[PDB]
Amino acid sequence: LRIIWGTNVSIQECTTNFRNFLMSFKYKFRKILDEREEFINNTTDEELYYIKQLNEMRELGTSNLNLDARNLLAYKQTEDLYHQLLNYPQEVISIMDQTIKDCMVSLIVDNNLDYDLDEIETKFYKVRPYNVGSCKGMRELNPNDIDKLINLKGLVLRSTPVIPDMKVAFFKCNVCDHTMAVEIDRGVIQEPARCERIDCNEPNSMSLIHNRCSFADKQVIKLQETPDFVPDGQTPHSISLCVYDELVDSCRAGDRIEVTGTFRSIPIRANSRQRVLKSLYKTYVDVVHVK
Amino acid sequence: DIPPEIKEEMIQLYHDLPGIENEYKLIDKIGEGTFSSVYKAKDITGKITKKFASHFWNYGSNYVALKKIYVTSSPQRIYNELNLLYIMTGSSRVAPLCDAKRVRDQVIAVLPYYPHEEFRTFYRDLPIKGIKKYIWELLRALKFVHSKGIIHRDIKPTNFLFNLELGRGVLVDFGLAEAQMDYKSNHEQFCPCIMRNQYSVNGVDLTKGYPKNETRRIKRANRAGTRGFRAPEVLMKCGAQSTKIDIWSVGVILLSLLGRRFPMFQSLDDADSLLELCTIFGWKELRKCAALHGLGFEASGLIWDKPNGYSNGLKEFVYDLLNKECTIGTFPEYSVAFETFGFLQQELHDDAYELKKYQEEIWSDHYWCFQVLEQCFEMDPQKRSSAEDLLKTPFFNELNEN
Amino acid sequence: HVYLYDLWQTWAPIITLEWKPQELTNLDELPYPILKIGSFGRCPFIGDRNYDESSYKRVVKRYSRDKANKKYALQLRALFQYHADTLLNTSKNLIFIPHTCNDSTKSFKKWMQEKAKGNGLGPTRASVMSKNMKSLS
Amino acid sequence: VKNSGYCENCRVKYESLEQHIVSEKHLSFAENDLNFEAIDSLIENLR
Ligand SMILES: Nc1ncnc2c1ncn2[C@@H]1O[C@H](COP(=O)(O)OP(=O)(O)O)[C@@H](O)[C@H]1O
Ligand code: BEF
Ligand SMILES: [Mg+2]
Ligand SMILES: [Mg+2]
Ligand SMILES: [Zn+2]
Ligand SMILES: [Zn+2]
Ligand SMILES: [Zn+2]
């Protein structure tokens, strides 16, 4: 019931499937999918992978879980969730994050562990998938593949400095000091036309305070691909990764990395006349995991 | 002469239980429950007949009731169940276990079969004598239970097996039953819900608002029970749930008899139960209870037929319940509800000698029933009288024959 | 709306539900159930949906069921009559207090005269929902 | 059909019970007696 618009994802069903996969994953399944059953271990394969990982996550206190998508392919009940994850990055990733938080708090509660749930529910957990299929290069990504998980490998040529990214504006009313904080949604900030107070109403009382806004890290990394396959007469191509938050300042120049993330496209403004955008979209990649 | 569609599961369980073919012969499936199914069987070896022979009611032949729990139930929960049934053996009102064993995951409990009649059969046509005896037995059983110091969260007529021919009843399910833990190592600070963990800025008041982005946690309190038969304590997730939720459920069952309504409180969620309680009692009373338990509550805009109504008491409520049945004529000519209807007609002001004696006695009985109903139906736990206090009522003069 | 909140606001509100006036148009399906009593010993908060106590077919079916169970109800009353016990009752047949009430039998006579011409367990869930969840919903 | 529920033993939600009981995790859980040791302790105390 209740699939989201423009997608094939149902929140309840996807959360159910992800919880099922978390509860009942054993590495022997991946061994079966790898046709490596002759290497099946009695110890590690028996033990529940992600439950244990969530445990050491709880004791250590980390907030990020790295998920192998081929493990999702291994589990029969979540084979469809794999394709749902490729085709719909952001929605399914948020679903996974909520499910991780739910599983953490549930596991604490069920065992009645002395560890307090104050930190757990306040924390924000992130899921970082990887090993999501093949590479296919960048010459072979058609525009229909916008906002999908892609796997890229190459050499990190150049790394820009840290670029602050606005998260909350801090407009201040000059007249009645009505300092409202505006969160950014879908990269848009909406100015109060007049003073949001009813008693005080002065449109010119607003003057954004740059310094008291809350920002977030953003680093652009120039990656030159080294695809496993190269078409005839194709010189190497450079793509612009865009990392966020903790991944900033992680990848140094000269590192040979394999990166997975969301293949995005953004209009580029023709600066000849302001607020006029070119019809050709620039393509870049948001980064979720770096190996 | 039995449905074979049940016989296939019977034989499936039979060969699923390799340690029972010689021990017992399965007779039939008698009971069905949310957490388990109950099977009737014959006792091949007589030692179990000798064991707890006094416990076995001697009415009819002696059979044994088999408790086939569902596999999905927690092993820790099943351990709680068996331990609790173990530590209240030999009570004659609580069902004592006779044997217990498991085959890998599946676990089976052996209980003395109690020939009973379905509650649906007789709630409509039970004389106030029947209510009196039934409630007396049930309160004696709960007196023993609370003396042992536990809480049987799910109290309902389905979980209480009463026999009319014997005129006695016993409790059976203890599935969600909880042992009362150590509450602590005046009444305003008895339960404002500040117990155990979290025990011992101004200018902002969320009196008429819900935060847009919610960044806070919910109460974590046991919610075990039934659809309905749930006490205001647990309904509002009020901390330190006491034994008296059980007597609240008892009073709910009692009122169900007085009105001939089996699904008395159809609560699809907590909100349904809370609003139904608001209807029966009043917004102000429920708000007062919440304030007593350190809990804010508000409701406005809703329309109620009785706006803070029924303050006269439960008499008016059961009164108009029976009034509409009277106008329609649902009840039979011989229905014993008509005497109650006349009782409320007389009290609300709205050969013959034996007749006058009989009506005098039923006046007294209905009177005492209605003043024990309000005795149990009060939101205050500390003020709510204990099971022994309920048994000490003037209505319960039949225990005085001891 | 209905709003129940922690007095010290240390914990999240338990129940917080508000309804638009427009969806309250029909009195039959209020989100908060009303004391629509109904009949035939049903739930006081539910009624005779797809049911009419005056429906002559329903009256006949109920009358037949009642006359079927006359003897059992009489046995119950005989078993339980003013002695507060069963075995103590062992040693007048019945006592009928008259009433002006209508019953199944009288209503039936009136009508005949008129026509004479799943599991129960669920995984524990977290309380706080992420803002992205709110956007998705 | 209607046998859809939550298997707290396996901490898992199943659409069908007959398949959950034969699931690998549930079968392994059943085959492990270490989870039932406390139960057996009171089982033996009966005799
Ligand atoms: N000893 C018994 N004698 C007769 N019926 C019983 C007995 N034990 C259980 N039952 C029947 O089986 C039903 C379910 O048993 P119960 O122990 O309440 O299981 P659950 O924990 O699943 O609710 C009861 O409501 C009752 O009808
Ligand atoms: F359904 Be039983 F009353 F746990
Ligand atoms: Mg039960
Ligand atoms: Mg139970
Ligand atoms: Zn202003
Ligand atoms: Zn309280
Ligand atoms: Zn299982």
Determination technique for this PDB entry? cryo-EM
Q: What angle do CA B8, B9, B11 make, to 5 degrees?
A: 65
- Residue A160 gets which letter from DSSP? P
- CA dihedral for B322, B323, B326, B330, sign (positive or negative): negative
- Contact between A27 and C131 under an 8 Å Cβ cutoff? The reply is no
What whole-number distance in Å separates Cα of residue B122 and Cα of residue B257? Answer: 10
What whole-number distance in Å separates Cα of residue D8 and Cα of residue D29? Answer: 12
Q: Which two tokens stand for residue B11?
A: 């034989």
Name which of A16, A23, A46 is nearest D11 (Cβ-Cβ): A23
> In B, which residues are within 8 Å of A122 by CB distance?
215
Mutate which of B38, B174, B176, B253 for ligand 2 pocket (most atoms within 8 A of beta carbon): B176
Determine if ligand 2 sits within 6 Å of the CB of residue B342.
no
Backbone angles phi, psi at B131, to 5 degrees: -60, -45
Backbone angles phi, psi at B354, to 5 degrees: -60, -35
Is B54 labelled as part of a ligand binding site? no
Kindly list the distances between the CA atom of residue A69 and the CA atoms of A14, A82, B335, D47, in Å, as whole numbers in the listed order.
15, 7, 68, 52
Q: Which two tokens stand for residue B124?
A: 């409509």
Name which of D21, D30, D42 is nearest B82 (Cβ-Cβ): D42
In three-state secondary structure terms, B142 is helix
What whole-number distance in Å separates Cα of residue B92 and Cα of residue B169? Answer: 9
Identify residues whose C-beta is under 5 A from ligand 3, the ion: B 33, 159, 173
Among chain A residues, CA nearest to C10 = A118
What whole-number distance in Å separates Cα of residue B351 and Cα of residue B354? Answer: 6
What whole-number distance in Å separates Cα of residue C5 and Cα of residue C16? Answer: 8
> In C, which residues are within 8 Å of B35 by CB distance?
120
Q: Which of A71, A52, A236, A233 is nearest to A138 (CA)?
A: A236
What whole-number distance in Å separates Cα of residue A53 and Cα of residue B164? Answer: 58
In three-state secondary structure terms, B295 is strand
How many Cβ atoms sit within 10 Å of the Cβ of residue B66?
Answer: 25
Among chain A residues, CA nearest to B197 = A116
> In B, which residues are within 8 Å of A117 by CB distance?
217
Is B30 labelled as part of a ligand binding site? yes
Q: Which of C68, C58, C40 is nearest to B259 (CA)?
A: C40
Question: CB A122 to CB B220 under 8 A?
Answer: no
**Cα of A198 to ligand 5 centre, how many Å?**
8
- Contact between A145 and A263 under an 8 Å Cβ cutoff? The reply is yes
How many Cβ atoms sit within 10 Å of the Cβ of residue D26?
Answer: 22
What whole-number distance in Å separates Cα of residue B360 and Cα of residue B339? Answer: 11
**Chains linked to D by 3 or more Cβ pairs within 8 Å:** A, B, C
Task: Write down how long chain D is.
Answer: 47
DSSP secondary structure, A201-213, as one string: --GGGEEE-STTS
Question: CB A19 to CB D13 under 8 A?
Answer: yes
- Contact between B353 and B359 under an 8 Å Cβ cutoff? The reply is no
- Contact between B247 and B151 under an 8 Å Cβ cutoff? The reply is no
| Residue carrying the six token digits 């250590």 | A60
**Ligand 1 atom closest to Cα of B114?**
3
**Cβ burial, residue A186 (10 Å; 0-12/13-18/19+):** exposed
Q: Which of B154, B173, B246, B365 is catalytic?
A: B154
> In C, which residues are within 8 Å of A11 by CB distance?
133, 136-137
Residue B154 annotated among the catalytic residues of the structure? yes
In three-state secondary structure terms, B104 is coil
